[PDB]
Scaffold this active site. Structure first.
Site, PDB file in Angstrom:
ATOM      1  N   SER A 213       0.856  -1.192   0.000  1.00  0.00           N
ATOM      2  CA  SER A 213       0.000   0.000   0.000  1.00  0.00           C
ATOM      3  C   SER A 213       0.892   1.242   0.000  1.00  0.00           C
ATOM      4  O   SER A 213       1.771   1.367  -0.870  1.00  0.00           O
ATOM      5  CB  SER A 213      -1.005  -0.133   1.149  1.00  0.00           C
ATOM      6  N   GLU A 346      -8.855  -6.377  -4.615  1.00  0.00           N
ATOM      7  CA  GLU A 346      -8.320  -5.251  -3.840  1.00  0.00           C
ATOM      8  C   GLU A 346      -9.429  -4.372  -3.274  1.00  0.00           C
ATOM      9  O   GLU A 346      -9.406  -3.998  -2.096  1.00  0.00           O
ATOM     10  CB  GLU A 346      -7.390  -4.399  -4.706  1.00  0.00           C
ATOM     11  N   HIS A 466      -7.513  -5.891  -0.224  1.00  0.00           N
ATOM     12  CA  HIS A 466      -6.279  -5.148   0.000  1.00  0.00           C
ATOM     13  C   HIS A 466      -5.714  -5.483   1.374  1.00  0.00           C
ATOM     14  O   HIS A 466      -6.437  -5.445   2.380  1.00  0.00           O
ATOM     15  CB  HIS A 466      -6.624  -3.660  -0.071  1.00  0.00           C
TER      16      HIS A 466
END
Length: 565
Positions: A213, A346, A466
């Protein structure tokens, strides 16, 4: 959720006592360029063991006159610094309790290894955490090294300044606050690592930087800036990069707005604004950060008020002198082996956001707000912009009425897959054949979890969202011992195994990883029209990236504007 807040509280206390039971009475001293450090041997729940050094300073505490400034080298010491316990995290709002926590005294790294005097110098893996440049830490309640230390590597987890304390930026050159202090912290940590990893058994000629990230955007920034040229040798970008729309912002006018929210009664000039912010309590600044973005900035879809920025003037420690897209043209990191990838769903990250604001699905009616800003007219009403939105809509609206799942699928592309595609294609103009390998994390389990599931209210919901892969790289306070034969345990071995193999050799394939024996994993070539990736599910299989068709639909928006792609 109040029910999850108690559950989280309980887990914190249980974790504390577990960590006592995992501490041995064996301590050890290692050398650093600034003085000796004392670490401790710890166990894992699998009865592996490692030497643990936490709270190693790589910079002077950025307090007083050093607030908002680039990090300065730390003061050396005589004697032995106790590194048997963690230090504070950077000041931030706790993602569970909602209250400000942490300290300005946060410029530390942690070093872990199963053997301080190994027979051969080891790959060094450096993890840069995510958290949108506003949350995160190197504490082992989220980033436990317990899985990596099964193997003969040195693992290092860094902290860096977050929020306005890490990312304030002022145009006035006399003030020496150009921006990106938190990225400059990362630079100084990587320099420390190059200069000191040998003292812990590490190979300074074989350093791999990886992050997820915002940590992936950070790793990419570390591969782009001249400040780090030649400092490391492989990079892994997990669910992000530095050309992602969320990864940078021009925040030079936002210091005044933050100061006003904090009680400032003066005029908008950088000098008076800085003097006020220099005197403010750090908790007050971080608490008010969520209110800084103006109505206009929210309208223009600016994601965060403070973060990585193009610096307005040059300084000795400057990290980003131009936009990251321009920096790719000359970047040293284009020429080191690279691995990139994403999870298979995600956008599941937005589950609870969509539960709170179901009207967000109405954005799918025309999709004009998802058109890249460099293609859209200012009012987002031009026929060409509507046509571009229509192409996005066709890619993700699969039924008669748009759904939350359609929205979440779109999110996977706008925030992750499409910037990954754009980066790969831009990078091919600026590298000499150095390989890039793609993975896709597609292993779904709820028997082993990490706190990101709680954040998205994702209990009981299927899909690989995610940050779900971090569960298979790092022990955390919600984890438990898994049976050797379990699909989860096998996924830990495979994920850490592939990362260690890539860190070692620059090639992520090894026939020693279970299920990889029949894998032919080639790097992406410029001539490839369809990307191939290693898909990690219960099996390891090379596949055409399933997202390619949608990626191509997003790319088609640039057919008449190819110079912007």
């Amino acid at each position: 959720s109040l029910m999850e807040k108690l559950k989280w509280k309980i887990k914190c206390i249980e974790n504390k006592f577990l960590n006592y039971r995992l501490t041995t009475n064996e301590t050890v001293v290692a050398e650093t360029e600034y003085g000796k450090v004392k670490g401790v041997k710890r166990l894992t729940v699998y009865d592996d063991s490692y030497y643990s050094f936490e709270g190693i300073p790589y910079a002077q505490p950025p307090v007083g006159e050093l607030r908002f400034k680039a990090p300065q080298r730390p003061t050396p010491w005589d004697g032995v610094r106790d590194c048997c316990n963690h230090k504070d995290k950077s000041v931030q709002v706790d993602f569970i309790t909602g209250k400000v926590c942490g300290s300005e005294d946060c410029l530390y790294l942690s070093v872990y290894t199963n053997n301080l005097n190994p027979e051969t110098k080891r790959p060094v893996l450096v993890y840069i955490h995510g958290g949108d440049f506003i949350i995160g830490e190197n504490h082992r309640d989220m980033y436990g090294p317990d899985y990596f230390i099964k193997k003969d590597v040195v693992l290092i987890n860094i902290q860096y300044r977050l929020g306005a304390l890490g990312f304030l930026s002022l145009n006035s050159e006399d003030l020496n606050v150009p921006g990106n202090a938190g990225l400059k912290d990362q630079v100084m940590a990587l320099r420390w690592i190059k200069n000191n990893c040998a003292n812990f058994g590490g190979n300074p000629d074989n350093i791999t930087v990886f992050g997820e990230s915002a940590g992936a955007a950070s790793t990419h920034y570390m591969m782009l800036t001249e400040q780090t040229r030649g400092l490391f040798h492989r990079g892994i970008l997990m669910s992000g990069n530095a050309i992602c729309p969320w990864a940078n912002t021009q925040c030079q006018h936002r210091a005044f707005t933050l100061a006003k929210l904090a009680g400032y009664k003066g005029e908008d000039n950088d000098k008076d604004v800085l003097e006020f912010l220099m005197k403010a309590k750090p908790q007050d600044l971080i608490k008010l950060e969520e209110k800084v973005l103006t109505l206009e900035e929210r309208t223009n879809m600016v994601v965060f008020p403070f973060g990585p920025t193009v610096e307005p003037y040059q300084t000795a420690d400057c990290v980003l002198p131009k936009h990251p897209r321009e920096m790719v043209k000359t970047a040293w990191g284009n020429s080191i082996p690279t691995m990139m990838g994403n999870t298979s769903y995600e956008g599941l990250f937005f589950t609870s956001i969509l539960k709170q604001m179901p009207m967000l699905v109405k954005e799918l009616e025309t999709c004009v707000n998802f058109v890249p800003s460099e293609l859209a007219d200012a009012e987002r009403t031009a026929p060409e912009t509507l046509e571009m939105g229509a192409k996005i809509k066709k890619a993700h609206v699969t039924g008669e009425t748009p759904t939350a799942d359609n929205f979440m699928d779109l999110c996977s592309h706008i925030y992750f897959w499409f910037p990954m595609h754009r980066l790969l294609q831009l990078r091919f103009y600026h590298t000499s054949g150095t390989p890039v390998y793609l993975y896709r994390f597609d292993f779904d389990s709820e028997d082993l979890i990490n706190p990101y599931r709680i954040m998205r209210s994702g209990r009981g919901v299927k899909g690989v969202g995610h940050a779900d892969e971090l569960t298979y790289f790092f022990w955390n306070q919600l984890a438990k011992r898994m049976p050797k034969e379990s699909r989860e345990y096998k996924t830990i071995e495979r994920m850490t195994g592939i990362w260690i193999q890539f860190a070692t050799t620059g090639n992520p394939y090894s026939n020693e990883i279970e299920g990889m024996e029949n894998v032919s994993w080639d790097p992406i070539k410029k001539s490839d029209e369809v990307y191939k990736c290693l898909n990690i599910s219960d099996e390891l299989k090379m596949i055409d990236v399933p997202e390619m068709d949608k990626i191509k639909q997003w790319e088609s928006m640039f057919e008449k504007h190819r110079d912007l792609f």
